[PDB]
């Protein structure tokens, strides 16, 4: 199946899922001197108080938190988005280098890592739902840099010793995910795609302009994860990210000037 290697990574993933070849797949470069400020797009409304974490996961092309999406806990409103959208996770991609791991670019800027919270338009009812329709999900996205450490990020890094392996997941309760944003919810906006597969173009993509810093200690934790079961040959998960595609007929927009 897919993955990130020479023979299975993301110039053949187009062969299992050709909507990879779409109109509005996902990541981008985003040319920030070409995105147009947008005055009537609204501040991004992120109500994260009852989130409700629940795992921490290995599913073999990245690690993933998961939350209750079964009542509006967290939900992600305003911005760009007309109605609900409940956050069901949230993933990182990374490099194997800090320069590079980010999806989306900035100028052609690569950032060490990316953010995705993964929200869904209560709408459709069940994101299985959502994923099927052009305003079914809202992703937020939000660059990292090597700096300074996180401290709200802490206590992902720390578990992440007991998911190594694809597969592998634990209890992970009560972590707020407030303590991974950065202090301005200033985003660009474009209508995407899910940037792993099936690649649905349902995405309402929010990328925040303001990175966070990791440290450089935080970051190798990522790097020591694996996309291998165990038992296996070992294989760093590392460069698990999806290179910038092809913008075609779309405008980015920008909330601030
Ligand atoms: N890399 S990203 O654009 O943040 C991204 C990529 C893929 C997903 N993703 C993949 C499968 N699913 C999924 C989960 C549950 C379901 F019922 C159907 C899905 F397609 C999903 O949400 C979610 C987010
Ligand atoms: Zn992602």
């Not at 147009?36 to 690690?63: C, E, M, W």
């Not at 956050?87 to 052609?108: A, I, M, N, P, R």
Request: hydrophobic content about 35%; proline content about 7%.
């Amino acid at each position: 199946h897919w993955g990130y290697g020479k023979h299975n990574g993301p110039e053949h993933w187009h062969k299992d899922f050709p909507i990879a070849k779409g109109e509005r797949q996902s990541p981008v470069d985003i040319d920030t001197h070409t995105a147009k400020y947008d005055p009537s797009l609204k501040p991004l409304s992120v109500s994260y108080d009852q989130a409700t974490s629940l795992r921490i996961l290995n599913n073999g092309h990245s690690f993933q938190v998961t939350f209750d999406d079964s009542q509006d806990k967290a939900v992600l409103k305003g911005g760009p988005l007309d109605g609900t959208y409940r956050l069901l996770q949230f993933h990182f991609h990374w490099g194997s280098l800090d320069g590079q791991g980010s999806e989306h670019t900035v100028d052609k800027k690569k950032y060490a890592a990316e953010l995705h919270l993964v929200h869904w338009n209560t709408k459709y009812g069940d994101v299985g739902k959502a994923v099927q329709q052009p305003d079914g999900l809202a992703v937020l996205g939000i660059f990292l840099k090597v700096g300074s450490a996180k401290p709200g990020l802490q206590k992902v890094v720390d578990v992440l010793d007991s998911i190594k392996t694809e597969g592998k997941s634990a209890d992970f309760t009560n972590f707020d995910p407030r303590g991974l944003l950065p202090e301005s919810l200033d985003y660009w906006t474009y209508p995407g795609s899910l940037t792993t597969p099936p690649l649905a173009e349902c995405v309402t993509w929010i990328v925040l302009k303001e990175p966070i810093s990791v440290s450089s200690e935080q970051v190798l934790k990522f790097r020591k994860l694996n996309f291998n079961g165990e038992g296996e040959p070992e294989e760093l998960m590392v460069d698990n990210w999806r290179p910038a595609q092809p913008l075609k007929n779309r405008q980015i927009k920008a909330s601030f000037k």
